[PDB]
Symmetry: D2
């Protein structure tokens, strides 16, 4: 009810920013070590600060640290506790530092660590997909455009689509990481300091490439948050497409995949209904990752220099986006490990819609017919085959009524198995082409037989 | 009477893309020439057929560049417009151009090439704006202005230091453009509809001919992927956020309340009855235009969310946002650079305002820490001294040494070299600080990096 | 040149020329009020009104040259009016700013656009109701988690979308009423000391009343935000229609076949019918969301009162409106050009045991606890899966192995046709319930 | 384990526990209808109602153990009910699904939250009107392009925000009415053949009527979308208040001083007063926009009818609602903890020639055309800029040199006080006009 109370609750950040504690401690140790080296604090002050910070870290890891809203945020929580433990030397940690450059440093360190963790998770999902592909390497499914059957494809070729998507995501994560890995520490409030700090020393100690060249930039920049949010959002769109695909494959209309009981829900009344809830939720969680990105874009839009309290609002969306994408990645990996393909159902489905048509057109082109004539002939033959009706079941006599170009060899180009084997272009679904790409990924991901 | 449209005509109005995708013509022609050359090399068309296609496509490109080409809605899109015109020009050979190709791999190829060219043009414009900003900084290298937190004056800084903030922002933007360009520069051409082909094409030849690093390794990915669009959109949006902050800053500096900056008449609007009113419209519109760049990004994120594999017609909606985003960001960059070349700083107005905000307080606290006083005591002392100044109506540099010595013995006559705004600025010394020698180092770096003479 | 680059960047006539009719109406009302208040003569007023009418006729005839060197729609019209009638044209500037003129014009444009959208929505609702009536007895699955859950009637499915669109029409009506207040007479932001009459112009332009605050009048764009949101939620509904119909057109579902006039195809696979209009409907919902985000972001953090940033409010509104009108209209065309495949659907239904919940309802009615009813029916479905039959093919004696409550009347609760007939709750898929709702909609849309 | 990882990813209780009151209200109404309809005994119904009341008391006393192994609010409450009362609890779910239950509960929660927001909006409007009344005579500049344009009264500026919030309240009212339709009785998606009565439960729960389509009932989240948008537009307004007050708190403007209780500072720079609460109000508008985008994107392209994706619609709604309530309340506290720096404001006004437009009005009233009046005034203002004086310090002789229409009455139109007094159009900043609008708002808000 007090104004001070209402403002305190509105402005407190510890409820969410306590997750930065490891990075805040690392940053404060590096700062103290540098201060001592530069003669701004004593070596005994450093010794006490380092030991006291390590004690606090241990207390937090053991869940014995009481986070307090009356201490506002992670930084003041940790520093007031340090003062309680070691006395007046703790008060020297503020020398030649502001909350403004401290928070920037801590957040960049947290984002760096979170990116490292995401990359491991992506590799794990890529491995899950490639292992699923190797286990189900011979299965043929329809390939779709406009959700219409277009050509036959190998199941491993489809799964490698998602592996390639995730590789571009990993690349964006690596590039983001490098760009963010510059140290804001030593910018102080915005202008730097006249005290004899060494910003190269703290940048090195904290694993940054070098110190940021402009103190105002250092305290005002949140591009690293934006870029990480965007990179999570693109990853999330890939997983939303995997979710759409697998929810469709789990339908009875498609009938291609059966999730295990452990990754689905059901009904006692309709025991055959198996709902793929985890992948629906993966699809749905792509939305909040997009919203998290919009939050911080809108937040930064039109802000003056240098530091503004508005930046407090960049933490929660980054934490949410990160937790969400990590979950989406890991659940998709578990789902991939807990699905079986319905081989008879798939086989029964493939004869519908003449997936061999393009192979037959390629046959005619190889025999010298122009592409348009080839397409016209094949469409007429398909037109003789409206029903169950299959091109490979037509007689040669029937084909010769349309063109003398057909010969007995045609049957090696018809049916869905021959069609897959006839694709030969780089990146194609041809069996040998897919075998080459599986080999690249078994090498790159260090997949073993064990 | 009123013409009565057919269903097909009503649908065609809704689905046509030529009204916007005509802007892909150069890339579409380059892609088709590369394809035809490959077809001939692989024996799929004759060398005669290839030569007819190449010369006909070059004629068509000349016609478009002359504004003598009639774009037709009844031909749907840029690809069919060009190829139907080619068939009208050369006849039968044109009909072999589409051998071992789909619109699905063609469109993806054409759009990547367009985005690659657009990124190259944006990086050039960014460097031009960085130069404009560095030149402004050099021209005004000695000017002191406040630095702000919470829109409250916090420390004194050099104007070149503030301007280099934007140069550093733009450098990260340029880095994002370079990284985006490299990731997009792989060729979808030869994925066909989605699965590849059994016809003997050469995807490495077309990739090389078109300046791509390599062919994409997955045909389904090649026709289904629009990450390059998303990444380019995001990179534009972040650039736009930087320019929106530049806009906010310069709209504030042009106010009478700040009074720091006067735009020229060529980059402002005014009032004949209020001749001192100078509205900084260009920078207001730069700030505003950041919004549509963010909207463009959201469009394509939302478009791709939840789509099944592989190619879907929804992807046609990826073009207009990318074109809008690109045209907007290029305008925003260029206009910001023109504004930077057409502003004057109001030196007397700035100077008169600086001395009364105790902006030297942190410098005095640094003095005390240098003389061996712990931080907390340094602040205690400085806060008390500023309190005396508020009482006396004076600046810290007006206090006697005797008065300071009433709170601490450490003060000596050298303290006066640490007080006042000019001396405060001079005392910043850390790397990346506003110190005059620090800033001079950074300006030297930028002058060399941008090849400024 | 610098002036040239800035002129190109700041020009708005390339997009804002679409406000011409509203700009002219607003200037006519302004001139009429100036004469009524004695600030201009009736002769000057008459010259202005006739000149503006002449210009409107020129624009409608495609004989008016829009000029970038006259910046925007307002200066293009007024400079042309000066050329046409001379000094009286200049009197329009009396007691007016571009700040209040543009806000007035844009509200009028939005009001007219919303009126058009409501007409289009009703047309699409009729198209859906007509498709429902043509297929009123068709049973299809109802889905949860993209799994078959219950049997439903196709008209019940289509009425989902009609009810969605009714909410959208309601938002349009509410939005229109809230924007229908006049900003004209706010001038630059503070009003005027000249003896204008803002009640007269408000009435003349069909507004409910003048806005009560001049700063608000020039600084407000909520009508744009609300209209953009309303368009975005309508687009969401159409994106779900698009998803459903792209699924239904798939071979895997096989529920419907679009006509050749509303699909794209393949010489080589003449059965490959792509539903491109409905995919593009789905995809266009994205730009309508992005247009909303644009104007939200534009307004966020702006100081009062008028700022040049507001020039950016027009393009997104025009885009959003053009887009949603297109989506609505093409969805109606698609609805008129689809044929269901009853044979395929009907043959797919028996394996799904969609009558299971109806059998559970039978047992609940006979006094069995619901949880027990579900377990027992699930066991019977298991028996059916094992025997390869439907529930209706089990003997009564087989059911009695699980409970004595089953009696010969059970067979009237089994099979999909019986199941649909047994739904009876208000708003349910039951045949009579759906017939009631169709009757409601036929009357409400004046279908003959 | 796998089961464990899925359980954690899919559990909703950590956030959806906040629906408990609505869940219990809905369940009691459902049980009451079941008993009236003969589906459960009256004794079973009485046991359920008493047990639900008991559980509500436990929750309100912080004695209820929420469990992730019971997934969500519905199962948490109902498994607890079964532990408390036994078998009768297991009849509660007769003729109901979680699909219609959750839609009902969320609508009720939204209806309550909207009611709470409207109260908080009215409180902020009163705070603003009270601030306006205390400072009713204060003149400040009005701005276009962040350049001083005309003199206005501080109450007129604050009434801008009150009018903005009135449109917000209108949107909240309209959104509440549209959401106030009952989905209960749609069951999984198709309704039921059990003899429920949906009108009875709609009545009991305060809904206008039952939703007319069961598939719509389980698949619709437009009420979330509309509530999220309405929060986002309110947040826009507050972000502009935030921008304005952070500017006014600057030393460059120097208009406003926040109290220590609503600001932060520096012990070494004791006149530095950071307006953190209003900066955070401005910044929190962003997450409200992001919450909207989340649910728009979630709904885009989703098939019918119920999908697990919808679990993601709660967190954004709860966040958006908590955020906007805080933004509203903190803005109201800030309004009660600011003082205007009257000498600083007064000293800044004369140099701007803010009376120029009032002088132009004077000349138009005396019969000069618009452009001539501006030509004359601009010349005079130029003279004053040279001489460093105000228009009101010019001699009538030197004015008459420029035009004979000037007379001694001109001085009553010069200077900022007279300029403000001379505005007369409805909604203008004129003293009498603003007094009228303040009176209107004092009555409307029941201020005593
Ligand atoms: Cl009036
Ligand atoms: Cl009754
Ligand atoms: Cl009922
Ligand atoms: Na506008």
């Amino acid at each position: 009810e007090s104004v001070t109370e209402k403002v305190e609750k509105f402005t407190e950040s510890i409820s969410f920013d306590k997750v930065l504690y490891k990075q805040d401690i690392m940053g404060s140790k590096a700062h103290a070590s540098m201060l001592a080296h530069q003669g701004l604090i004593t070596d005994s002050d450093k010794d006490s600060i380092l030991r006291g910070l390590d004690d606090i870290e241990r207390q937090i890891e053991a869940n014995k640290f009481e986070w307090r809203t009356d201490r506002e945020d992670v930084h003041m929580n940790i520093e007031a506790a340090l003062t309680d433990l070691i006395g007046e030397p703790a008060k020297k940690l503020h020398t030649a530092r502001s909350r403004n450059d401290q928070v920037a440093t801590d957040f960049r360190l947290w984002c760096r660590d979170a990116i490292d963790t995401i990359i491991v998770k992506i590799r794990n999902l890529q491995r899950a997909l490639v292992e699923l592909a190797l286990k189900n390497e011979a299965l043929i499914v329809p390939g779709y455009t406009h959700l219409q059957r277009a050509q036959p494809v190998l199941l491993p070729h489809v799964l490698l689509t998602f592996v390639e998507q995730l590789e571009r995501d990993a690349g964006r994560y690596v590039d983001c990481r490098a760009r963010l890995n510059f140290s804001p520490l030593g910018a102080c409030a915005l202008a730097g300091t006249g005290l004899p700090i060494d910003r190269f020393m703290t940048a090195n100690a904290l694993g940054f490439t070098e110190p940021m060249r402009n103190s105002i930039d250092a305290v005002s920049d949140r591009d690293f948050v934006l870029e990480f949010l965007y990179t999570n959002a693109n990853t999330g769109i890939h997983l939303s497409r995997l979710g759409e695909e697998w929810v469709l494959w789990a339908s009875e209309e498609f009938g291609f995949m059966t999730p295990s009981d452990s990754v689905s829900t059901g009904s006692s009344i309709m025991p055959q209904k198996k709902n793929p809830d985890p992948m629906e939720l993966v699809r749905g969680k792509s939305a909040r990752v997009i919203g998290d990105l919009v939050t911080v874009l809108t937040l930064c839009k039109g802000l003056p220099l240098a530091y503004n309290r508005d930046f407090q609002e960049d933490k929660e969306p980054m934490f949410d986006s990160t937790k969400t994408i990590m979950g989406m990645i890991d659940v998709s990996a578990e789902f991939a490990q807990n699905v079986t393909f319905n081989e008879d159902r798939i086989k029964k489905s493939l004869p519908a819609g003449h997936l061999d048509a393009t192979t037959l057109a390629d046959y005619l082109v190889k025999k010298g017919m122009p592409f348009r004539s080839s397409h016209d002939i094949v469409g007429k033959l398909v037109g003789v085959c409206v029903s169950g009706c299959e091109l490979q079941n037509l007689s040669l006599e029937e084909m010769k009524k349309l063109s003398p170009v057909f010969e007995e060899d045609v049957f090696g180009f018809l049916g869905v198995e021959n069609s897959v084997n006839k694709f030969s272009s780089y990146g194609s679904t041809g069996s040998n082409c897919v075998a080459e790409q599986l080999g690249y990924w078994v090498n790159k991901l260090n997949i073993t037989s064990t």
